[PDB]
Amino acid sequence: FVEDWDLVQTLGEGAYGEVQLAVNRVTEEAVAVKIVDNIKKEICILKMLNHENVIKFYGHRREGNIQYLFMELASGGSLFDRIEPDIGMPEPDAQRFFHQLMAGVVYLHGIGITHRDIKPHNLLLDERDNLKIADYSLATVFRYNNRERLLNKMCGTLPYVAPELLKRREFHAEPVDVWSCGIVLTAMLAGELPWDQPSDSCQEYSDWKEKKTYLNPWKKIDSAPLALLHKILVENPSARITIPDIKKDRWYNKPLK
Numbered sequence: 001f002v003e004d005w006d007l008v009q010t011l012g013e014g015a016y017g018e019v020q021l022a023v024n025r026v027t028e029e030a031v032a033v034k035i036v037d038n039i040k041k042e043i044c045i046l047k048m049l050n051h052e053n054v055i056k057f058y059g060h061r062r063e064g065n066i067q068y069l070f071m072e073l074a075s076g077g078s079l080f081d082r083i084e085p086d087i088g089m090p091e092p093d094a095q096r097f098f099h100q101l102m103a104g105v106v107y108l109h110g111i112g113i114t115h116r117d118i119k120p121h122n123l124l125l126d127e128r129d130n131l132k133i134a135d136y137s138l139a140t141v142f143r144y145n146n147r148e149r150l151l152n153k154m155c156g157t158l159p160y161v162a163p164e165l166l167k168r169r170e171f172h173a174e175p176v177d178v179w180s181c182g183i184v185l186t187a188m189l190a191g192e193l194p195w196d197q198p199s200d201s202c203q204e205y206s207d208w209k210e211k212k213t214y215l216n217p218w219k220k221i222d223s224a225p226l227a228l229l230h231k232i233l234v235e236n237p238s239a240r241i242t243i244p245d246i247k248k249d250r251w252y253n254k255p256l257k
């Protein structure tokens with residue numbers, strides 16, 4: 001369906017466009033291809049990406065209106081599909097995925113890139129269940145020539161967004177991504193999202209700020225990972241734990257099955 005590649009089946013759809021499995025008729029190599037028709041930007045960011053926990057970019061092709069973004073195939077599918085509703089997954093699997101997600105986010109932050117839509121749909125698995133951060137549709141530069149710029153665009157997915165993104169005119173990129181990593185960890189350990197959005201008017205958010213951890217999803221989570229979620233899901237982004245400090249957390253470093 002494109003040059004040497006056949007488009008076998010749909011892998012899913014994001015905001016704009018669709019992702020297909022592409023098998024090479026000759027080589028039998030299978031990749032993923034995103035079919036689109038802002039996009040100059042995504043391509044530019046995709047070409048920066050070189051890390052084991054980030055989806056690799058292979059190259060692009062415009063054929064009329066349609067753009068084709070060839071990227072690493074994650075044959076394990078999404079983290080979303082490993083989260084059992086109302087249960088989550090075994091704590092050692094969740095810890096391993098969390099370690100990989102941090103590795104990925106440190107890498108992105110280190111090249112001055114914020115993902116801005118971290119959630120289990122955008123977290124993919126290779127054939128060895130290695131986590132890959134995928135979909136650079138909303139990704140943006142927050143650091144250039146060693147100068148940070150504050151963000152102002154509201155974007156992402158409400159249950160995953162940090163509260164400052166609803167309250168502040170401008171905010172730091174990195175603590176928004178840390179927050180969404182904490183919602184992902186909650187989802188992995190409890191198989192449910194704690195609130196529709198982190199606003200004053202959201203009773204489940206108020207409950208958390210009042211430390212009612214006898215409620216779900218918190219009552220399903222062991223005390224060690226929950227102590228970490230206490231440091232991540234902190235309303236003031238300048239008091240929120242940073243990744244260097246996540247890497248010193250007792251649960252983060254706890255040996256597990």
Ligand SMILES: C[C@@H]1CCCN1c1c(C#N)c2c(N)ncnc2n1C
Nearest residue numbers: 011012013014032072073074134135
């Ligand atoms: C993450 C997006 C969102 C829509 C579905 N997606 C994707 C990919 C991307 N990109 C992707 C990929 N590279 N390998 C395998 N499966 C993929 N799926 C489901």
